């Protein structure tokens, strides 16, 4: 429900009409297919909130 944005060093997702940066996560995003098709795709971490929970 947002747009991916960078401040020059870090990547965030925001709502479109008001700047409010959030960490990119598996809850903020959806997957479709692999890296090869999309024109202008960028490499970044996507955080998964379950993985530190499994680390408990």
Partner 1 sequence: LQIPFAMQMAYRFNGIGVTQNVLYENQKLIANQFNSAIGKIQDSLSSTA
Ligand X SMILES: *[C@@H]1O[C@H](CO)[C@@H](O)[C@H](O)[C@H]1NC(C)=O
Ligand Y SMILES: *[C@@H]1O[C@H](CO)[C@@H](O[C@@H]2O[C@H](CO)[C@@H](O)[C@H](O)[C@H]2NC(C)=O)[C@H](O)[C@H]1NC(C)=O
> Residue numbers of the site for partner 1 (CB under 8 A)?
3, 16, 30, 32-33, 37-40
Instruction: Select the binding partner of residue 37 from partner 1, ligand X, ligand Y, none (C-beta < 5 to 8 A, by kind).
Output: partner 1
Long-range contacts for 45-54 (Cβ within 8 Å, ≥24 apart)? 47/23, 49/25, 50/26
Structure tokens belonging to residue 22: 């959030």
Contact string 18-47 vs ligand X (x = CB under 6 A): ---------------------xx--x----
Among 10, 43, 48, which Cα is nearest to 27's?
A: 48
Interface contacts to ligand Y, rule CB under 6 A: 7-10
């Amino acid at each position: 429900e947002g747009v991916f944005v960078s401040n020059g060093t870090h990547w965030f997702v925001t709502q479109r009409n008001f700047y409010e940066p959030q960490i990119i996560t598996t809850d903020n995003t959806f997957v479709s297919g692999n890296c090869d098709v999309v024109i202008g795709i960028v490499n970044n971490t996507v955080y998964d909130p379950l993985q530190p929970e499994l680390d408990s």
